[PDB]
PDB file of all heavy atoms in Angstrom:
ATOM      1  N   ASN A 252    -138.577 -58.768-141.959  1.00  0.00           N
ATOM      2  CA  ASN A 252    -137.822 -58.433-143.163  1.00  0.00           C
ATOM      3  C   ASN A 252    -136.855 -59.538-143.572  1.00  0.00           C
ATOM      4  O   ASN A 252    -136.663 -59.777-144.768  1.00  0.00           O
ATOM      5  CB  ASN A 252    -137.060 -57.124-142.955  1.00  0.00           C
ATOM      6  CG  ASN A 252    -137.523 -56.027-143.890  1.00  0.00           C
ATOM      7  OD1 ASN A 252    -138.656 -56.043-144.373  1.00  0.00           O
ATOM      8  ND2 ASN A 252    -136.645 -55.068-144.158  1.00  0.00           N
ATOM      9  N   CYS A 255    -138.621 -62.453-145.300  1.00  0.00           N
ATOM     10  CA  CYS A 255    -139.126 -62.077-146.616  1.00  0.00           C
ATOM     11  C   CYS A 255    -138.132 -62.452-147.711  1.00  0.00           C
ATOM     12  O   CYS A 255    -138.499 -63.079-148.714  1.00  0.00           O
ATOM     13  CB  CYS A 255    -139.436 -60.579-146.637  1.00  0.00           C
ATOM     14  SG  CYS A 255    -139.763 -59.898-148.269  1.00  0.00           S
ATOM     15  N   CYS A 333    -140.039 -50.660-150.093  1.00  0.00           N
ATOM     16  CA  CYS A 333    -140.427 -52.032-149.786  1.00  0.00           C
ATOM     17  C   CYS A 333    -139.316 -52.794-149.079  1.00  0.00           C
ATOM     18  O   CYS A 333    -139.598 -53.681-148.267  1.00  0.00           O
ATOM     19  CB  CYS A 333    -140.828 -52.769-151.060  1.00  0.00           C
ATOM     20  SG  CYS A 333    -141.542 -54.400-150.751  1.00  0.00           S
ATOM     21  N   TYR A 334    -138.055 -52.482-149.377  1.00  0.00           N
ATOM     22  CA  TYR A 334    -136.964 -53.120-148.653  1.00  0.00           C
ATOM     23  C   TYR A 334    -136.877 -52.636-147.213  1.00  0.00           C
ATOM     24  O   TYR A 334    -136.363 -53.364-146.357  1.00  0.00           O
ATOM     25  CB  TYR A 334    -135.635 -52.881-149.371  1.00  0.00           C
ATOM     26  CG  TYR A 334    -135.588 -53.435-150.779  1.00  0.00           C
ATOM     27  CD1 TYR A 334    -134.839 -52.810-151.767  1.00  0.00           C
ATOM     28  CD2 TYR A 334    -136.297 -54.579-151.122  1.00  0.00           C
ATOM     29  CE1 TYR A 334    -134.795 -53.308-153.058  1.00  0.00           C
ATOM     30  CE2 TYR A 334    -136.258 -55.084-152.411  1.00  0.00           C
ATOM     31  CZ  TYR A 334    -135.505 -54.441-153.373  1.00  0.00           C
ATOM     32  OH  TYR A 334    -135.459 -54.933-154.655  1.00  0.00           O
ATOM     33  N   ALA A 335    -137.378 -51.432-146.926  1.00  0.00           N
ATOM     34  CA  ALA A 335    -137.372 -50.896-145.570  1.00  0.00           C
ATOM     35  C   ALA A 335    -138.667 -51.174-144.820  1.00  0.00           C
ATOM     36  O   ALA A 335    -138.652 -51.267-143.586  1.00  0.00           O
ATOM     37  CB  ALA A 335    -137.114 -49.388-145.602  1.00  0.00           C
ATOM     38  N   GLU A 336    -139.783 -51.308-145.533  1.00  0.00           N
ATOM     39  CA  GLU A 336    -141.074 -51.596-144.917  1.00  0.00           C
ATOM     40  C   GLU A 336    -141.139 -53.069-144.524  1.00  0.00           C
ATOM     41  O   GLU A 336    -141.067 -53.953-145.387  1.00  0.00           O
ATOM     42  CB  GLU A 336    -142.204 -51.235-145.879  1.00  0.00           C
ATOM     43  CG  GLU A 336    -143.596 -51.533-145.361  1.00  0.00           C
ATOM     44  CD  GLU A 336    -143.882 -50.860-144.034  1.00  0.00           C
ATOM     45  OE1 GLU A 336    -143.660 -49.635-143.926  1.00  0.00           O
ATOM     46  OE2 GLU A 336    -144.325 -51.557-143.095  1.00  0.00           O
ATOM     47  N   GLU A 337    -141.282 -53.332-143.222  1.00  0.00           N
ATOM     48  CA  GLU A 337    -141.279 -54.707-142.733  1.00  0.00           C
ATOM     49  C   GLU A 337    -142.486 -55.496-143.227  1.00  0.00           C
ATOM     50  O   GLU A 337    -142.412 -56.724-143.346  1.00  0.00           O
ATOM     51  CB  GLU A 337    -141.231 -54.717-141.204  1.00  0.00           C
ATOM     52  CG  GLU A 337    -139.914 -54.236-140.609  1.00  0.00           C
ATOM     53  CD  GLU A 337    -139.028 -55.380-140.145  1.00  0.00           C
ATOM     54  OE1 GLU A 337    -139.561 -56.474-139.863  1.00  0.00           O
ATOM     55  OE2 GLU A 337    -137.797 -55.184-140.061  1.00  0.00           O
ATOM     56  N   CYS A 339    -143.900 -55.120-146.214  1.00  0.00           N
ATOM     57  CA  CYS A 339    -143.862 -55.244-147.665  1.00  0.00           C
ATOM     58  C   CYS A 339    -142.900 -56.357-148.047  1.00  0.00           C
ATOM     59  O   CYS A 339    -141.741 -56.358-147.620  1.00  0.00           O
ATOM     60  CB  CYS A 339    -143.435 -53.939-148.340  1.00  0.00           C
ATOM     61  SG  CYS A 339    -143.461 -54.023-150.166  1.00  0.00           S
ATOM     62  N   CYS A 340    -143.385 -57.301-148.849  1.00  0.00           N
ATOM     63  CA  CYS A 340    -142.532 -58.352-149.383  1.00  0.00           C
ATOM     64  C   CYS A 340    -142.766 -58.527-150.877  1.00  0.00           C
ATOM     65  O   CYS A 340    -142.542 -59.609-151.427  1.00  0.00           O
ATOM     66  CB  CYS A 340    -142.756 -59.668-148.641  1.00  0.00           C
ATOM     67  SG  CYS A 340    -141.435 -60.861-148.893  1.00  0.00           S
TER      68      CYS A 340
HETATM   69 NA1   NA B 502    -139.260 -55.550-146.838  1.00  0.00          NA
END
Side-chain angles (χ1 to χ4, degrees):
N252 244 25
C255 169
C333 188
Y334 299 148
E336 178 56 51
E337 291 258 337
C339 183
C340 197

